[PDB]
XYZ file of N, CA and C in Angstrom:
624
model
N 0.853 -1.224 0.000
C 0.000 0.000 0.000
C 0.877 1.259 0.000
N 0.488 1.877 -1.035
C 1.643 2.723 -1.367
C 0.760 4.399 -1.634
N 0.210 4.572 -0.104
C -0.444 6.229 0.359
C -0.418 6.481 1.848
N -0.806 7.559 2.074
C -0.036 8.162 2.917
C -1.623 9.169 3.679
N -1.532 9.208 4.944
C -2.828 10.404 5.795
C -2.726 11.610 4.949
N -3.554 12.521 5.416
C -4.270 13.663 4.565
C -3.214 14.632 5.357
N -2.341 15.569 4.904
C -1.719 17.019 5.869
C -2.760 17.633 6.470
N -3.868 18.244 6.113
C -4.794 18.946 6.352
C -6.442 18.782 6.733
N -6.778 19.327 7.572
C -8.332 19.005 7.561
C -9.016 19.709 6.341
N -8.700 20.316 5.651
C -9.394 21.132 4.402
C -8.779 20.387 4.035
N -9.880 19.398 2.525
C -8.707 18.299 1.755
C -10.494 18.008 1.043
N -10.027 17.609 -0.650
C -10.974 17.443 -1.785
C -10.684 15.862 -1.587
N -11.961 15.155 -1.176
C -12.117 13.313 -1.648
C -13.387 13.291 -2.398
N -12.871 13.232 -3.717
C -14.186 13.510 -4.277
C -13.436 12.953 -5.483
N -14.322 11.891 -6.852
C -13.936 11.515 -8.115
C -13.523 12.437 -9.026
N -11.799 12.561 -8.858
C -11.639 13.935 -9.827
C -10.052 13.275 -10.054
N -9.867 13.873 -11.755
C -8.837 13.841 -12.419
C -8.012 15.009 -12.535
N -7.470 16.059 -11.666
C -7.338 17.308 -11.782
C -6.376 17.961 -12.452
N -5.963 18.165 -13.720
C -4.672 18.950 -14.365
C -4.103 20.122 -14.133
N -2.976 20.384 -13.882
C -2.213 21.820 -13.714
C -1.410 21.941 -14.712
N -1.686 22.696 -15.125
C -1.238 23.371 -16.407
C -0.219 24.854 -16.478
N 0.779 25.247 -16.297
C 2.004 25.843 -15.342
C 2.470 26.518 -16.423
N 2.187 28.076 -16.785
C 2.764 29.111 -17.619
C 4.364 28.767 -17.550
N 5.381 28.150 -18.546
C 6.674 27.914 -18.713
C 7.082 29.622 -19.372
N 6.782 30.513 -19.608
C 7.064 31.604 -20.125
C 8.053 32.560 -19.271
N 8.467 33.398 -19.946
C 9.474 34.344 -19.007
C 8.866 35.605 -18.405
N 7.274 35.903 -18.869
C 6.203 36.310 -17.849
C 6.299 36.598 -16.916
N 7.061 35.332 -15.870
C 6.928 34.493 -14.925
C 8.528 34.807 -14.761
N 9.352 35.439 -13.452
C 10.294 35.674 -13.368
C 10.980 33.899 -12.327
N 11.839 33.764 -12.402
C 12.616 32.622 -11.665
C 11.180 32.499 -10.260
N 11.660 34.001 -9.552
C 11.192 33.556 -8.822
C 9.545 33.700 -8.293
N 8.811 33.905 -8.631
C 7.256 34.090 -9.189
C 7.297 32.859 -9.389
N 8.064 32.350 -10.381
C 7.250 30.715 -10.728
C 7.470 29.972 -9.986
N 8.435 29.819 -9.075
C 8.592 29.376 -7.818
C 7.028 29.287 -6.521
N 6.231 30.505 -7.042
C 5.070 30.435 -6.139
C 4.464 30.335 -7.134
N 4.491 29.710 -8.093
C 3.238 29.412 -8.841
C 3.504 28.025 -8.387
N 4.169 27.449 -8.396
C 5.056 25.974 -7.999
C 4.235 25.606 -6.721
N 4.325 26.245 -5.760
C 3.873 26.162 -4.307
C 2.777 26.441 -4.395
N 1.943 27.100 -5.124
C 0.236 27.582 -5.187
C 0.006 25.717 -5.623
N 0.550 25.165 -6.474
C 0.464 24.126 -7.069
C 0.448 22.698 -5.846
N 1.564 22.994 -4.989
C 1.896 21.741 -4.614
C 1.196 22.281 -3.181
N 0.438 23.366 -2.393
C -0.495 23.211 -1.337
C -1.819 23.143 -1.816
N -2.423 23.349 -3.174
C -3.552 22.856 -4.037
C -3.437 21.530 -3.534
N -2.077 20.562 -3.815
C -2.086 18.876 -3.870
C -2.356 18.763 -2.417
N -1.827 19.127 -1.590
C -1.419 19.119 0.254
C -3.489 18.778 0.251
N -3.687 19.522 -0.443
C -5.446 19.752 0.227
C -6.513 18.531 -0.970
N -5.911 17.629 -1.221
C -6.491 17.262 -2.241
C -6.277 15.421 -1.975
N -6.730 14.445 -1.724
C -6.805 13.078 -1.637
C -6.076 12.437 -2.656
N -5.122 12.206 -2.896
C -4.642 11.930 -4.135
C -4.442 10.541 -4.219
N -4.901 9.975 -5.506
C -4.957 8.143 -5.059
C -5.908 7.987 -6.252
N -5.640 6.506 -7.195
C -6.215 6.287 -8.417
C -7.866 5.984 -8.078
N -8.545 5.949 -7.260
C -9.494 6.022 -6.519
C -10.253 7.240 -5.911
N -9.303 8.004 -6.158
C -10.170 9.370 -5.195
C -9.578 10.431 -6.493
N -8.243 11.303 -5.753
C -8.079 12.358 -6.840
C -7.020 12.229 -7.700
N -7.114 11.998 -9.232
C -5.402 11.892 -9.630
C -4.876 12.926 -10.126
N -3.740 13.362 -10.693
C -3.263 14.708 -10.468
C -2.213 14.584 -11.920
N -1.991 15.740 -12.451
C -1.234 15.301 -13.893
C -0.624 16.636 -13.398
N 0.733 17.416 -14.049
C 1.028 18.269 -13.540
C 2.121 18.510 -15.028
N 1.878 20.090 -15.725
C 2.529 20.361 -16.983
C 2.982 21.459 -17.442
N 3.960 22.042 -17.557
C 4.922 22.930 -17.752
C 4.907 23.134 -19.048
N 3.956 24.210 -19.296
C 4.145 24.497 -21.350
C 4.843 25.827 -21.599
N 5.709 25.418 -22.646
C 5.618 27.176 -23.308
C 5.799 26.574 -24.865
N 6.717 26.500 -25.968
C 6.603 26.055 -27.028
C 5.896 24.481 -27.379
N 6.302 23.460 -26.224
C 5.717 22.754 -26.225
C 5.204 22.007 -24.785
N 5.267 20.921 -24.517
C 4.628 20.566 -23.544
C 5.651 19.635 -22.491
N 5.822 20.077 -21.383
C 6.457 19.083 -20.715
C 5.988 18.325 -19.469
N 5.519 17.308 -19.333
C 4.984 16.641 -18.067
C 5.408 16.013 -17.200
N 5.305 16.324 -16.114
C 6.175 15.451 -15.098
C 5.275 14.680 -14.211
N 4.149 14.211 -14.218
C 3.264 14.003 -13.585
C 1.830 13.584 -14.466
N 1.727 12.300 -14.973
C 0.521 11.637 -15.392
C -0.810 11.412 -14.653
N -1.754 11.581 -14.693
C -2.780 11.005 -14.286
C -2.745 9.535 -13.397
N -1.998 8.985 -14.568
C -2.274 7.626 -13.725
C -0.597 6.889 -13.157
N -0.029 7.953 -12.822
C 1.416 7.815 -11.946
C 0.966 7.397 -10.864
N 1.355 5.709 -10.657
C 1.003 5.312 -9.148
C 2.040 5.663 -8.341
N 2.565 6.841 -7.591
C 3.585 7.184 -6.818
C 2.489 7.611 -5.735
N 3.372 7.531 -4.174
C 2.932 8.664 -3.045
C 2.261 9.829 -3.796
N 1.100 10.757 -2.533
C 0.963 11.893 -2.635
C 2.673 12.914 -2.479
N 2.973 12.271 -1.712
C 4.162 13.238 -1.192
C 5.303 13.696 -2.306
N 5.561 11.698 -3.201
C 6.380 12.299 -4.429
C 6.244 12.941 -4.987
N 4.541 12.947 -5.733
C 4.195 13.715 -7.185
C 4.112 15.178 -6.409
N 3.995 15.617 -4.662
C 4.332 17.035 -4.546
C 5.547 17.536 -4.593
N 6.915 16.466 -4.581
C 8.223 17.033 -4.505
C 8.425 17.270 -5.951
N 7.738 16.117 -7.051
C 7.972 16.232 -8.774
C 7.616 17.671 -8.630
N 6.424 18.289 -8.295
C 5.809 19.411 -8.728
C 6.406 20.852 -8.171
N 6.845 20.704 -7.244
C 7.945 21.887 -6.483
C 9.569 21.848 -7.004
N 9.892 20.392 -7.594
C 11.201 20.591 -8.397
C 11.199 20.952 -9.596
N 9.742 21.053 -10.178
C 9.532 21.411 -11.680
C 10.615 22.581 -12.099
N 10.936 22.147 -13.447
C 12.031 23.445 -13.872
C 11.606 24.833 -14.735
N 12.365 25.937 -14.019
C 11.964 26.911 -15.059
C 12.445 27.068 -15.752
N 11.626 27.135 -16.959
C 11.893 27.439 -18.597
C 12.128 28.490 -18.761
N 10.758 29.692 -18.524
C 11.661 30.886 -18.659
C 11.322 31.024 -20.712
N 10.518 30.448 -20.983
C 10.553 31.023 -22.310
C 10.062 31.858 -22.804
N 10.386 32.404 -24.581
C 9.750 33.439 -24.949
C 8.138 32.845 -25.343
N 7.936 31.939 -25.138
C 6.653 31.725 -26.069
C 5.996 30.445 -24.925
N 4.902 30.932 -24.299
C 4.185 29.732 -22.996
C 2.812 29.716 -24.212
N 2.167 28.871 -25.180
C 1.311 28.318 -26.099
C 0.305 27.798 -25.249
N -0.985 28.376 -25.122
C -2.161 27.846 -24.498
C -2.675 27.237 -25.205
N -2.749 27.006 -26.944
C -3.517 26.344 -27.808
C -2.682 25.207 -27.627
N -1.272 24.874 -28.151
C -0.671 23.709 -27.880
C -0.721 22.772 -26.137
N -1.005 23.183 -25.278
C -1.334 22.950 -24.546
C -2.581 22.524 -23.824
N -3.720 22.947 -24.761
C -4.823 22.580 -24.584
C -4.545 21.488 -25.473
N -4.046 21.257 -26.229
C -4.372 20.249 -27.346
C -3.677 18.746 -26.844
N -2.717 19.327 -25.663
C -1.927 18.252 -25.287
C -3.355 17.310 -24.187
N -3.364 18.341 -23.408
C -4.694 17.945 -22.735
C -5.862 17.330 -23.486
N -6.327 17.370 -24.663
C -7.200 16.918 -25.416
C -7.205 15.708 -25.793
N -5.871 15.366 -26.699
C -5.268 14.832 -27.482
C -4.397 13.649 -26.852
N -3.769 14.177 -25.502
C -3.008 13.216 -24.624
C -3.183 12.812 -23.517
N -4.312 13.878 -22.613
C -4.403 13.398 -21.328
C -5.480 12.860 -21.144
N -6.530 13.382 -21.929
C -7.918 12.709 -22.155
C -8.319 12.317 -23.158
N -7.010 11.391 -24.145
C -7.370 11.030 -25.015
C -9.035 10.156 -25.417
N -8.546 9.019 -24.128
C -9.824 8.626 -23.850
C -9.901 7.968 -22.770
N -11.160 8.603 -22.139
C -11.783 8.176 -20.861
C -11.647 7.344 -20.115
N -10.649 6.969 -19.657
C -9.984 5.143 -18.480
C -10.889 5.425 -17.486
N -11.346 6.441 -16.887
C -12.495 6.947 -15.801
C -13.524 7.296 -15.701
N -14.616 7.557 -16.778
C -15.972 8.093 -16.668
C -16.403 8.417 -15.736
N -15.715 8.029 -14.390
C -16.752 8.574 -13.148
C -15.986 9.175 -12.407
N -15.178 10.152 -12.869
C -14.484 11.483 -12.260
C -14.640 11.963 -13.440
N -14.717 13.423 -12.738
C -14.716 14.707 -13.365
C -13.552 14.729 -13.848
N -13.450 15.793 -14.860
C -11.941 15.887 -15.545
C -11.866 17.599 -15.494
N -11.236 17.835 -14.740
C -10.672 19.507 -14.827
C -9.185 19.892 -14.994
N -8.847 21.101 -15.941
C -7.708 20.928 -16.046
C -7.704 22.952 -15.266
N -6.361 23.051 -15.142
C -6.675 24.167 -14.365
C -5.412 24.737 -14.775
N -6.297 26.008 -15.857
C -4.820 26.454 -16.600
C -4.204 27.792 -16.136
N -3.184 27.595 -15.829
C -2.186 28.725 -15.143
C -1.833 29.772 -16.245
N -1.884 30.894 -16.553
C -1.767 31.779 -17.382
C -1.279 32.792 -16.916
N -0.075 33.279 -17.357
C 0.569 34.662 -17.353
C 0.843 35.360 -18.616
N 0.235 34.937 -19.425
C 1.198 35.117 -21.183
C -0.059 35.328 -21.907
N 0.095 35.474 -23.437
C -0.372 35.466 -24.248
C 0.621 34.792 -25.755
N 0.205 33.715 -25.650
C 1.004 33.589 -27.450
C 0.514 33.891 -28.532
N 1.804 33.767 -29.836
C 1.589 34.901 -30.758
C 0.554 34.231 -31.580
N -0.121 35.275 -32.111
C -1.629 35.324 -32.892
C -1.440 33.785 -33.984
N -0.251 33.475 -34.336
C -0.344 32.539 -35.470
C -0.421 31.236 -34.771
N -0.252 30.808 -33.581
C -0.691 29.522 -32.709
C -1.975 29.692 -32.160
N -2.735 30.687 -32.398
C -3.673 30.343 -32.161
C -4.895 29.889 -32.900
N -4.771 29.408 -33.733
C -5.582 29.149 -35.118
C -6.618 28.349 -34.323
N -6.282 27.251 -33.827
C -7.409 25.973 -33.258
C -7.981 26.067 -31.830
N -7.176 27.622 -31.421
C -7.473 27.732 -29.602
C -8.754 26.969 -29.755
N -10.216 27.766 -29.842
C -11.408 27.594 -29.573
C -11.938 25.907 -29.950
N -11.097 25.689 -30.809
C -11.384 23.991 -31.308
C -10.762 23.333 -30.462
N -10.070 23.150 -29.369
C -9.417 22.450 -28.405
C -10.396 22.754 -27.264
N -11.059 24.432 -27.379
C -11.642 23.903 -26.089
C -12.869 23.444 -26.075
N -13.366 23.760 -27.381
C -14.907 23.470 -27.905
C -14.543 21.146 -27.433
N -13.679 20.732 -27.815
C -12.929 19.657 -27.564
C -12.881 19.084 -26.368
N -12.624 19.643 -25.389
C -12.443 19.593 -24.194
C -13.497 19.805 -23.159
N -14.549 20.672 -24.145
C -15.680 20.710 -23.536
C -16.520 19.415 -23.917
N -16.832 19.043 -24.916
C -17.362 17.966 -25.548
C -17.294 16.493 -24.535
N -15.749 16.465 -24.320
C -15.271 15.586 -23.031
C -15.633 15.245 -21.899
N -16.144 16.925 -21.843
C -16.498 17.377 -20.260
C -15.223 17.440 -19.407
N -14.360 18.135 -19.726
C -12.995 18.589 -19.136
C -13.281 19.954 -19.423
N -13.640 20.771 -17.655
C -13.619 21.872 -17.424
C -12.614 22.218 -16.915
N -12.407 23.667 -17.754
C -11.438 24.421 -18.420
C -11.577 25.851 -17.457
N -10.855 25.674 -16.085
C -10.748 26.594 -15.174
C -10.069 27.966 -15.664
N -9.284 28.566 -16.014
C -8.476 29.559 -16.522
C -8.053 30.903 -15.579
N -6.780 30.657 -14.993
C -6.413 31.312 -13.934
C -5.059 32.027 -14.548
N -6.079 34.032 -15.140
C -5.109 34.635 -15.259
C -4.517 35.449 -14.248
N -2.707 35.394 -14.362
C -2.207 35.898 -13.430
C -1.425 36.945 -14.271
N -1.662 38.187 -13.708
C -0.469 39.369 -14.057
C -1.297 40.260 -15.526
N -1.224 41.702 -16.031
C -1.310 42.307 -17.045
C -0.975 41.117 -18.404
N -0.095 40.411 -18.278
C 0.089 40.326 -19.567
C -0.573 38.726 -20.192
N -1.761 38.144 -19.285
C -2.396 37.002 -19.188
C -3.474 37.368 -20.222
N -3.346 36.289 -20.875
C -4.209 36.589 -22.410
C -5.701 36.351 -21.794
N -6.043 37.585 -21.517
C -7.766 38.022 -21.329
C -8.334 37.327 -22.119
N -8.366 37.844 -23.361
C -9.205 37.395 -24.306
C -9.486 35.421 -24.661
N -8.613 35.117 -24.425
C -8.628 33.416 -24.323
C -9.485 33.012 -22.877
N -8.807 34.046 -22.295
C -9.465 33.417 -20.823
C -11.163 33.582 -20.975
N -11.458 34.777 -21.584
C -12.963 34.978 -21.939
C -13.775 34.148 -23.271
N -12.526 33.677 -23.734
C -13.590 32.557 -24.492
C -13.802 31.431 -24.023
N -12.674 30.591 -23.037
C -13.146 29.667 -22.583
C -13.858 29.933 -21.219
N -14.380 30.834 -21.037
C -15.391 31.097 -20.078
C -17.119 30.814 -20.385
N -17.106 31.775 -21.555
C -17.890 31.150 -22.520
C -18.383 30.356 -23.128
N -17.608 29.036 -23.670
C -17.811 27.695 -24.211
C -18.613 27.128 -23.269
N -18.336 26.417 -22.048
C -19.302 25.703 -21.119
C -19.583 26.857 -19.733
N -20.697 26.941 -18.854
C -20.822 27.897 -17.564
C -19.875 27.369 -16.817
N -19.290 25.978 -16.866
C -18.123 25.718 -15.434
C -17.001 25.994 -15.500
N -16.694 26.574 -17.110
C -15.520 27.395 -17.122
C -15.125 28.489 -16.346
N -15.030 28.648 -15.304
C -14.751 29.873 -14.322
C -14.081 29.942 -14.102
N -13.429 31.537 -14.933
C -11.957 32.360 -14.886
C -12.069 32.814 -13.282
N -10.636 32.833 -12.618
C -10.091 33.288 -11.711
C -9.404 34.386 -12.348
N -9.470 35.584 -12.587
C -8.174 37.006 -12.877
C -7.437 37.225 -11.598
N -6.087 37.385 -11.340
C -5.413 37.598 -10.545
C -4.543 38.747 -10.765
N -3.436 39.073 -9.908
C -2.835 40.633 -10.336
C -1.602 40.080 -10.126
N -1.009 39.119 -9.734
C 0.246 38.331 -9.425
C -0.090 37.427 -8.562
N 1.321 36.501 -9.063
C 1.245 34.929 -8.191
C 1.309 34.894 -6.955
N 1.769 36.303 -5.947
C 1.073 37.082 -4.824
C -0.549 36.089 -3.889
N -1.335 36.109 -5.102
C -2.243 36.407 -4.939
C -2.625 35.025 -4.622
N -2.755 34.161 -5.410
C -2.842 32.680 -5.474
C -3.060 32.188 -4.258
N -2.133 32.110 -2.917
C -2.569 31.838 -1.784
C -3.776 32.415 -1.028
N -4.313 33.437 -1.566
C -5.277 33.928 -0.990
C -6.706 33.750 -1.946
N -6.353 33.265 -2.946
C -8.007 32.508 -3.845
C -7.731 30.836 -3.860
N -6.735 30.137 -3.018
C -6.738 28.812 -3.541
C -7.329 27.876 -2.683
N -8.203 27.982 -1.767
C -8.892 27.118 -0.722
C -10.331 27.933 -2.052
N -10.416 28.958 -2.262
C -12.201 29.010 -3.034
C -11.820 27.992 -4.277
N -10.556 28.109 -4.868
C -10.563 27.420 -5.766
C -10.206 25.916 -6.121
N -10.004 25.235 -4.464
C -10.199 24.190 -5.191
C -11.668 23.562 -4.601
N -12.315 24.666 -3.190
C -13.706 24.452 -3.425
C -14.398 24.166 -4.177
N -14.066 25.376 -5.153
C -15.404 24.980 -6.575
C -14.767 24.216 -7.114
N -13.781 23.417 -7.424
C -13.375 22.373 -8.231
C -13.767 21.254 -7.524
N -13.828 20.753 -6.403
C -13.793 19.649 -5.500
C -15.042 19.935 -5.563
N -16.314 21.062 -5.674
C -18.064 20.691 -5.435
C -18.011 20.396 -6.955
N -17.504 20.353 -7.833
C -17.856 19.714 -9.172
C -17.972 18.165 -9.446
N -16.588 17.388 -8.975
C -16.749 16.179 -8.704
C -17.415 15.502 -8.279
N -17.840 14.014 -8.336
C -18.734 12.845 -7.872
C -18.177 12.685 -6.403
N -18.812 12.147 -5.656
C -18.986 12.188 -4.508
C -18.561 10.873 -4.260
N -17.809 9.704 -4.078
C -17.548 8.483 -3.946
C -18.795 7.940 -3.769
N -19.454 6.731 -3.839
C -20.750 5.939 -3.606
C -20.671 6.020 -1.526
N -21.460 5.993 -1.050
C -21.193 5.428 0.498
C -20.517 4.361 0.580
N -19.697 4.064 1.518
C -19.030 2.567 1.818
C -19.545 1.622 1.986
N -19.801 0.504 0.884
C -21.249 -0.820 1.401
C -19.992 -1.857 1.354
């Protein structure tokens, strides 16, 4: 048996597949992404993690996609929080929300091993990429909605592409943008936010 007690009395046990999705852009200074890192890994601290309750995928985009953390990684809660606090910064010119949704589409929910968890992916945004990657944005999330993988969108800082964040707000009502003013901030909206993510999920059956 390979899990571990809950850190916290605030903690999500509820049927959920939850994705973090981690602005790799230079947006995001060394050390900023460092607390985007930690917004990330006390999200996990509060969250049941176990192929049974919550599983957790965890992804670092900017040109393309890097994952350190699958869905269905049978490791400790504790490892996949040290994977997610050692994550590296990239630091690039270009963090791609369309390629990144598509990874999520295309790779993480290719297809359904779970039907009875929710699938939310919860995209970290400080950036905006350039107008010519975005050709298929809305078709990844129109995609993702179809799935039923709600598409949280948590912009952080002036230069967090509004306008993306307001279309996938749009596509399904459970798309609900978080706007933030810096990664500052994150500790002080992340118990509402993984509230409303954790009241979205199935509720385990009672214990018979």
């Amino acid at each position: 048996d390979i899990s571990e007690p809950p850190l916290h009395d605030f903690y999500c046990s509820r049927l959920l597949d939850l994705v973090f999705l981690l602005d790799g852009s230079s947006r995001l200074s060394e050390a900023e992404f460092e607390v985007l890192k930690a917004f990330v890994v006390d999200m996990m601290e509060r969250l049941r993690i176990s192929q049974k309750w919550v599983r957790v995928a965890v992804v670092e985009y900017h040109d393309g996609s890097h994952a350190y953390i699958g869905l269905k990684d049978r490791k400790r809660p504790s490892e996949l929080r040290r994977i997610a606090s050692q994550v590296k910064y990239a630091g690039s010119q270009v963090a791609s929300t369309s390629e990144v949704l598509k990874y999520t589409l295309f790779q993480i929910f290719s297809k359904i091993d779970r039907p009875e968890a929710s699938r939310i992916a919860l995209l970290l945004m400080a950036s905006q990429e350039p107008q010519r990657m975005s050709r298929n944005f809305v078709r990844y999330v129109q995609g993702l909605k179809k799935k039923k993988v709600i598409v949280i969108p948590v912009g952080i800082g002036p230069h967090a592409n509004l306008k993306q964040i307001r279309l996938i707000e749009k596509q399904a009502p459970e798309n609900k943008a978080f706007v933030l003013s810096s990664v500052d901030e994150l500790e002080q909206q992340r118990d509402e936010i993984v509230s409303y993510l954790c009241d979205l999920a199935p509720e385990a059956p009672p214990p018979t």
